[PDB]
Design a binder for this molecule. Structure first.
Ligand SMILES: CC(=O)N[C@H]1[C@H](O[C@@H]2[C@@H](OC[C@H]3O[C@H](O)[C@@H](O)[C@@H](O[C@H]4O[C@H](CO)[C@@H](O)[C@H](O)[C@@H]4O)[C@@H]3O)O[C@H](CO)[C@@H](O)[C@@H]2O)O[C@H](CO)[C@@H](O)[C@@H]1O
Ligand SMILES: O=c1ccn([C@@H]2O[C@H](COP(=O)(O)OP(=O)(O)O[C@H]3O[C@H](CO)[C@@H](O)[C@H](O)[C@H]3F)[C@@H](O)[C@H]2O)c(=O)[nH]1
Length: 504
């Protein structure tokens, strides 16, 4: 009944051999196996991992179900999407190493059988999977709702999650209206403080100036369509560097050295010899740029002005968020930055040329943020499993609360970030009446209730407070056009933004 850490993958390899759909994920785990085992040993030396209860865990991979018709397993080796498979691989491995009893499902049959068996304590699932869960179990699916952790790469903002509020705003997202606690949404990057950051591990095989060809650039973009209207950009880079590619070819200049779609180990070799990894603008927020940076590549990161969102970009229409991307990879831009990441206006030929010349003259510094290491991911998911409880113990602890007042036109996300903090939506409940507001030296001469994502709000001219009337509408996202927002912030560990200092 207590969890014991695992240091041998033999049982995991047995579980993943049982579906062809797991093949790509099994090969990833195999490539990274020695790093994983080193990391769970290192974590166990730093932190008491004793006295943890072994959980029975459902892992339901909706994206790999026949019944989903997503056909992601089908394209895993031929240039199809991999970012979700990377995250599922790393989650399953983390759960396994931490000693939990994992029940892996990629079918309605397995889903039914596991949930039939009872004693499930935690459920990892995607939004496509959650639709299947609800249909399969019937009305008692809600009995398990507080155990769900929903892998949702791009994030779900509260205004899309609240079914009635979303309807009232005319949000037609096919992904939203689940009415969960939004911290139950697990994201690919820490872009949505209403949600939890799950992430993944960045694959790299280094243990360097002679290995790396100073002259060699590699284009990020494994599909021909991605290269449309990039020729001035690529011509500037080609003035100074060889331009290589991994494309599965009418958009691709004649001078480009195409290697085709590479296996994991061959791609990693290509990164380790590359000076510059070249963003074209798409895809958004993938793992590949972090893999490049972990291998000592600089990343040329197209700047978006205006920032891209469901308001101006087809890709984002129907996604359950209004979040705006300031670049192809905002995490790389904001949490890494120069010299590893150069965020440039692709239409500023002088800025592009200056960036390429700078990168040519840079010293090579392989870099991985701690939160994207094996040990960083184990520490984060262990903390979530042990401390995150939506089933009713307050975590993060109230000690971590720092209250900030967002100016008009400023969100709670923005005001926390501007103080090197992060919005903590679990603390909004402590900011939502006259008495609580005195504590933080805001004085409500009058007040009212509103069901609005933009409250609690303060008019400092009229000394008027609007408080939240629907607790499911508490939202880090959103700026009040007229009033100040009363914003719950917390500290974060540098390199581990998911955790406060007193959260371990
Ligand atoms: C796996 C998952 O749900 N990932 C996140 C999701 O991302 C979207 C998702 O779409 C999955 C596939 O769903 C259907 O099977 C199709 O619509 C696929 O499109 C394919 O065919 C199109 C032609 O009809 C073509 O335009 C396109 O090139 C593609 O080959 C979808 O791929 O997964 C993909 C893969 O990363 C992603 O690009 C999609 O945005 O978004 C959810 C909401 O934000 C998120 O919760 C989830 O994690
Ligand atoms: O055929 C396709 C494929 C993708 N896309 C789009 O690209 C998006 C992100 O691609 P992907 O998830 O595979 O991540 P990427 O950064 O390329 O890294 C993978 O691929 C890398 C190898 O290139 C690998 O090293 C890394 O670990 C992986 F995560 C995906 O959500 C699709 O919208 C597409 O439209 N058509």
């Amino acid at each position: 009944s207590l969890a014991e850490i695992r240091t041998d993958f033999n049982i995991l390899y047995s579980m993943m051999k049982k579906h062809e759909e797991f093949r790509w994920m099994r090969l990833r785990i195999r490539r990274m196996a020695d790093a994983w085992i080193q990391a769970i040993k290192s974590l166990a030396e730093k932190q008491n991992l004793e006295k943890r209860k072994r959980k029975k865990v459902l892992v339901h991979l909706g994206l790999l179900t026949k019944e989903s018709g997503f056909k992601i397993a089908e394209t895993a080796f031929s240039g199809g999407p991999l970012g979700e498979l990377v995250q599922w691989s790393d989650l399953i491995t983390s759960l396994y190493l931490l000693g939990h009893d994992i029940r892996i499902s990629a079918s309605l049959a397995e889903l039914k059988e596991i949930m039939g068996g009872g004693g499930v304590e935690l459920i990892y699932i995607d939004i496509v999977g959650l639709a299947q869960f609800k249909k399969t179990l019937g009305p008692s699916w809600v009995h398990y709702q507080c155990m769900l952790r929903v892998l949702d790469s791009f994030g779900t903002e509260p205004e899309f999650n609240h079914a009635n509020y979303a309807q009232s705003k005319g949000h037609k997202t096919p992904w939203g209206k689940w009415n969960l606690n939004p911290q139950q949404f697990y994201t690919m990057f820490p872009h949505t403080p209403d949600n939890s950051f799950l992430g993944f591990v960045v694959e790299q095989h280094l243990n360097i100036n002679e290995i790396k060809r100073q002259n060699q650039s590699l284009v990020y973009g494994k599909v021909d369509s991605f290269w449309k209207n990039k020729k001035i950009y690529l011509d500037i880079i080609h003035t100074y560097m060889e331009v290589h590619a991994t494309v599965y070819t009418k958009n691709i200049p004649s001078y480009v050295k195409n290697h085709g779609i590479l296996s994991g180990r061959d791609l990693q070799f290509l990164l380790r010899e590359t000076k510059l990894f070249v963003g074209l603008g798409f895809p958004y927020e993938g793992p590949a740029p972090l893999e490049a940076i972990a291998n000592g590549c600089a990343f040329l990161n197209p700047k978006f002005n205006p920032p891209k969102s469901s308001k101006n970009t087809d890709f984002f229409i129907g996604k359950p968020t209004l979040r705006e991307l300031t670049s192809q990879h905002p995490y790389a831009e904001v949490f890494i930055g120069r010299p590893h990441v150069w965020t440039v206006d692709l239409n500023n030929q002088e800025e592009v040329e200056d960036a390429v010349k700078a990168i040519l003259n840079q010293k090579i510094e392989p870099y991985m943020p701690y939160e994207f290491t094996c040990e960083g991911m184990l520490q984060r998911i262990n903390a979530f499993i042990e401390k995150q409880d939506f089933c009713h113990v307050m975590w993060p602890p109230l000690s971590a609360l720092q209250v900030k007042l967002a100016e008009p036109g400023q969100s709670c996300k923005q005001v926390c970030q501007e103080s090197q903090l992060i919005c903590e939506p679990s603390f909004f409940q402590h900011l939502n009446k006259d008495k609580d507001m005195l504590k933080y030296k805001v004085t409500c001469q009058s007040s009212e209730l509103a069901k609005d994502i933009l409250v609690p709000s303060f008019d400092p001219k009229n000394k008027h407070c609007v408080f939240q009337g629907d607790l499911l509408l508490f939202s880090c996202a959103g700026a009040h056009p007229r009033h100040q927002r009363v914003c719950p912030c917390r500290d974060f560990i540098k390199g581990q933004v998911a955790l406060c200092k007193d959260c371990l």
